[model samples]
Structure formats: C-alpha cells, structure tokens
Target: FQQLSARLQEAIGRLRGRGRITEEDLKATLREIRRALMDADVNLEVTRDFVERVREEALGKQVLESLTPAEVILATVYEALKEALGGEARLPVLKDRNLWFLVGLQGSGKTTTAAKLALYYKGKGRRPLLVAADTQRPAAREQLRLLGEKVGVPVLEVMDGESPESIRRRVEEKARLEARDLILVDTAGRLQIDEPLMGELARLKEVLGPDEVLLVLDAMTGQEALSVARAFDEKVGVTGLVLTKLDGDARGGAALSARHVTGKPIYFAGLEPFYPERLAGRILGMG
Candidate 1:
C-alpha cells in the first residue's frame, strides 16, 4: 500500500514542479499515472479506463488563478480515484431475514470472514447464524464451527451427503427457532473455477435464496483477481465484495479494479468496513 501510494504521489509530484503546462506535459502526466496503476497490478482494462478518464478531464483544461497545474491534476486524479473505487461506502440491505452467501476461490478468506460478519452484525443487535455449507472438506466445517463457538454464535453444519435443499430446510428451521435474523452461509471454493463445484454452489444459492451474495477476494491475488471475480460474478451473481489480506504486501490494485469490473460495492476490507473516500485520500497522500 505504501509503495503504491508513493508511486501515485510521485506521478502527481511531477506536475507540481511546473508553473505553466502544455499538451506535452499533460501527456507525460497521464503516462505516469497509467504506468503507476499498471505496475501496481491493477486490471489492464481498468487501468486503461482510469487513465483515459483522467486524460479526458485534464486535457486542455484551464487552471483557475487560485489553483496551480499540479492542484488541478491532483483534483482530477482524486475524483477519478473515488469514482474507480465505489463512489461511497455501502452496506448490505438488512431485511427481517437477511441471508448472505459467501463465495470465492479457495483460501480467499471466506471462513474467517463469516465469523467476523457474525461478530459485526451481532454487535448491532442482530442475531447471526453461521452456516457451514462447504461440504467438500470436513476441516472447513470444523474451522467454521470453532470460529462460531469462539464468537458465541451458533453454527449449522451440513451432514455428509446432504443435499442443498436439505441444508436449506435445516438452516431455515434452525434460524426460526434461534431467532437469528442474519444468516451467513460459507460455501467451498476450488483451487480454480471448477464447473461441478460451481454448479453445486449455484444449487445452494437457488435453494437458500440469499439476500446478498458477497464475493470474498484476496487483495494479494493482484490482476488474477479480476478474472476470478468475473467468473464468479457471471456464474453466481455476486452482489458485493469483501477483500482480505490488505494488511499484507499486496499492492492493493485489485481493490480498485475489482469494484469497477463487478460494479458492486466493496463492503469490507478484511474485518474493517471499506471507505472509498478514505482510500482515495490516502492513495493521493492526503490522509
């Protein structure tokens, strides 16, 4: 994150040096902006769109007497950054009964996220039920069970050879008795996009009728995150995103690119809620 911030500020810093700007200078500025985002592993199409938008906004623009060339450029980039990331923070729609289906590539942090969401919504006075829907691995079910116990939330696990309809029936009955309003369903992920697994998930989704399909993504996945997101969005119909591992060495470009690609709000980054304005401000070195 720091490295990408430095690259962005460095690109903008170049424009700050001059009192007057020309077409050639604007071209150079846009070039550096494109290079910075591309090198940081943002999706190619996303990067191109970002750079082109910046170019369109800055090209042949008249600088106000109160603003310097660099300030104007900064303003354009800042606006573009906010637009690329979702325009504002968005939360899932909470109905009388809220069912959130979690999906992603394997090891994308679905289990931990399910637990955290239980804790988060629970804090808001919502009774959350954690559903261990990953029938592929016993260990995955165990992990959710332990996490559920740790959070003092009840977990419903799928029995061996249980069908999606059965799981759905059991979950609804349990939720009704437990008075749980928010149900977080954690599904399995494969090493890559597999049709059988995808079909299984789709079946679960059809049965469960989740209010929100939250796609969990690893920020460290980089540009590959875009393709994975595309496959999941096309197949499962993702309603929102949750990015994990932002605390790591990931350049964090995927955060910017994925939202644009999916056109869905990023509800959380790890356990913390995502704030697009804050991220844009930070990347621009304003925060």
Candidate 2:
C-alpha cells in the first residue's frame, strides 16, 4: 500500500489544481495512474482492469469538479481497488461444530496458516482440534504439532500408509470427543500441475465437507498467484483465499489479482514480517 502511495502521489498531484474534472480532463490522471502501475511491475491487472474493464464516470464524477480533485481521484481509485480485492471486505466466521480445510500452492505455508486460523478461532472460545492430514510431507505433521503445542491445542495425527479417508473420520470423531467443535485440517501443499495430488485433495474433501475450503496463496507469487488460484479452482477447488504475505508489494497486488481471478475474498492471511493491523483485526477483531 505504501509503495503505491509513494508513486501515486505525483500521479494524483497533476489531477489537482484543475477545475471541472471530466473524462476529457481526468484522462491525464488515469494515464498517469496506468503509468505508475506499469512501473509497479506487479499490478498489470489493476492497470488493465481500470483502462478496459472500468468504464467512464467511474472517476469522472460531478463531485470531482471542484470538491478536492485529488481526494476524488483517491476515492475513485480506492473504490475500484476494493472491488478488485474481492469486493467489500469481510472476515470469515467459524461457527460451532465447523470444519475448515486449508489448501493451496506447495510451500505457501498452509500448515502454519492453519495454526494461526485455529488459534484465531480458539481465542473466540471455540475448542479447536488441529488435524494433521499431510502425510506426504514428513515434517508437516510435526510442524503443525509444534505450533499446536505452542498454542496449547491438541493435534490429531494420522500415521503413514494409513488412508487419509479414514483419517478425516477420526478428525470429526475426535473433535466431538474432546468437545472441540471446530476442526482445522491442514492438507498437503499441492502444486497446480499435480493432478494426482489434487485428486487426493478431492478425496479428503469428499470424506469431509468442510464449512470453509480456503486456498493459501504466497504473496511472493505476485499476480501469478491468481493464475495459480484459477488452476486450483479447476483442480483442488477453492471456496476462498488465504494471502500469506505482507510488508511488500505482494500485500496489495496479490490480493487484487487473486480477487479478480476468482472473485473470492480472503478467509485468512498470514505473514512473516508481521501482517497488516487492519487485516489481522478483521480476522481476529482485535482493533
């Protein structure tokens, strides 16, 4: 967000000090914004969508004539940005006796994200059980186990060579037994091209109908993350998104691209350099 702000200030500046902003006059500012997005190198979709998808009158408003033209451009850009970033922003709800399945690109940090999500809901007084169904990764189960241990939540493990189909049944049963009504299953990190892995994911979903099926996206992937999301929708099936990066261009660009690609809002977000205060607040309702 800061990155765009830094560059767009000059772009928005030219639009100011001008009276009666119209498509004929605002054209320069739009061109300048497109120029900024091109230099941004990660938000072509934003530029393309604005120049093509969005029509006139979006920025050419009568209120923009003399009512702080700079503010009008900012407001216009923000409204457009929010729609591209999965429409109106809202957080996911983890109802009682619910199952949440997290999926996405390999190494997108699904296991850790699941823990964060579980911890988030747990703070809301939901007795959550972390189900480790990632038998494909030797360390995945242990990784989640460690995080669960830190969070003080019990983990249900499925031994190797054991069918994951039966494992999911255990997850549900264990959830009920421990009085844990919320079940968060961290599935294997799936490559978009791997059909068999996606089939296995399908098997897991067939066995357990989760309340939310979220796809964890790596912020580092930039706009390409949207293509990955579409590929997963065609393969593993995505109900929503989990953007796993912040403190970089990925913060703004990936969210817009992913939202545009699938029209799916993010259910959860995780990061290493610390996530945005508002994004985290929206998820956990802290601020």
Candidate 3:
C-alpha cells in the first residue's frame, strides 16, 4: 500500500479538468490499479474490499469532504488493496523492541489512535506494522490499515469469514517470526458491555497476547471510561490504557483512573508519549 497511496495521492494531485466520479472513472483509474494486483493473483475478498471502499468513499459522504473525491477514493483503495499489488515482499525492521496490541475496549478512539500512532513511530525513526482484523468494519479496517501511507509500514490484515482468534494469532505470529517490532493490532470492538464481549476479548488475549494489550479508549469517553476499563482489564489483560489526556487529544496524554482503579497504568501519558508538532509535520506531508 506504500507507493499506492503515494500514487493515489499523486493521481489526485494531478487530476486536471472537470470529471464527475463515475463507475467508469473508478475503472479507468482502478482498472489500472487492479491490473497490477491481479497480475500478482490477489484473492476475491481482498479485491472486493478495495473496490468497495474506494467506490464507497468516492460516491459517499467522503466525496463531500474532499474537493478531489477521486483522489480520496483512490487513497482509500490503497489501504484495502494496494499492498496486494506489491506482489509478495517482506517487511522492513522497526528496531524490533516491542509489539503493541491496541485492543478496542471501545471503538471510540481506535482509528485516530492508530493514525496518531503511525505518525508517532514514523517520527521516532520507527516504521510500523498495522494489523486489521475486524471483518465487520471495512471502512474502519481501511482507516486502520491505510496508515501505511504516512510511512512505508506494512498494513497487515485478515479478510472475509475468519475468527478473531485466527486473525489474532496470525497477526502476532508475524511480528515474532519476522523479528520485528511496533505492531499495533486493531481488534474488534463491542458497543455494549456484556458477557459475549468479554468472551471475545478473552479469546483474543489468549490467541494474540502482546507485550502490551493496550486498551483503546475513546478520548471523548469521560466518567464511563473507568467502568469499562475496569471491566475490560480482566479479558483485556491490559498493561496500560491508550487514553487521550487533554482536550480530547491532549498532547500530554491522560492521567489514568485505570491505573489506580484497575491497576493498568496509562499507556499513553505525558511521559515520552510522542511530541505532536514534529510528528504531525511528518503525517501532514511535512517530515
């Protein structure tokens, strides 16, 4: 997905005259996109996810958000399918010290947190390994996976009908086998706090145990955050909490009640959490 996003970014930057984004418009660009992926023999589900997200972004609400809708759609396309186009290559090193599993205790902040993380690692001179396992949320997964663009980190994922355990195991196994570091797994989330959610979380914990099972809390979630963090800590087996401390995305990170209450320290804190200015520059076409 590396050059694909850059290419899609390049394509959007180069789009010249008037043209409404049509089915054919996608084919004109995407057929070109597909030809490369197809030559490498990408499977069906992966292909479908790519075109669907690209089409959805082009024709849906994101189009309204982008002056160059085609560029944005093409950009989304890379998140979902561009890597398959890379034919089969190996991952680069991230200084290989630790791997992070950003469990979605709540869907609240997972996506942006991943994007925020991409910028963080990129600035640290660390590349990333972003894994997407939630088959239910295609758009969510792409947003999670698409971060490969900011830096050439690989966005790994499992598609179609697969159990969380299987995806989790595979995601972790890759990190270890590759002798790599800095893998952030975006696991599936449940809206309601209930029995089933714990079961699922517990299972994933066993399957994809991490150096840090960092609970992803929506920075927007306030008081209720404690209850959920405490509740999730058992199955979450959390070492820390990925909370946004200030002003929703406070640069200092947050003081965690989870640490005192549930005993999981605030994984994201003012202490060495990542300086946003220089990092933001890297993400915003800067560094």
Clashing pairs in 3: 241-267, 245-253, 245-254, 246-250
Off by over 4 Å in 2: 18-25, 39-46, 52-55, 58-60, 190-192, 271-287
Residue pairs with colliding backbones in model 1 are none
lDDT, candidate 2, 1-287, per-residue tens: 55555566676666666665766556767776677666554467567886543335444565444557766665566556555555555566656578878887667877888888778877778888898887767687898899999988999877775686678768767877899888888888755558787888888787788888888888777777777888778876778888876545523567656655677777555732222334322221123
Candidate 1 has its poorest 10 consecutive residues by lDDT at 58-67
Query: After superposition, which runs of candidate 1 have C-alpha atoms over 4 Å from their true positions?
Result: 59-61, 64-67
- Name the better of 1 and 2 by TM-score: 1
lDDT of 3 by residue, 1-287 (tens): 22232444444444434345554555666665554333323333444555556666566655544556655654455344322222122222334465666766545676567657756776776656787766666776777666666556677777765786778667667867764467777776667677876676677667766667767675445446656777777655766666653444321112212333455544353223523233322222334
The alpha-carbon lDDT assigned to residue 183 of candidate 2 equals 86
How much is the lDDT of residue 248 in candidate 2?
A: 52
True-vs-predicted CA distance for residue 185, candidate 1, Å? 0.4
Q: Is candidate 1 or candidate 2 better by lDDT?
A: 1
TM-score versus the correct structure, for each prediction: 0.94, 0.84, 0.52
lDDT of 1 by residue, 245-266 (tens): 9878337688888777778789
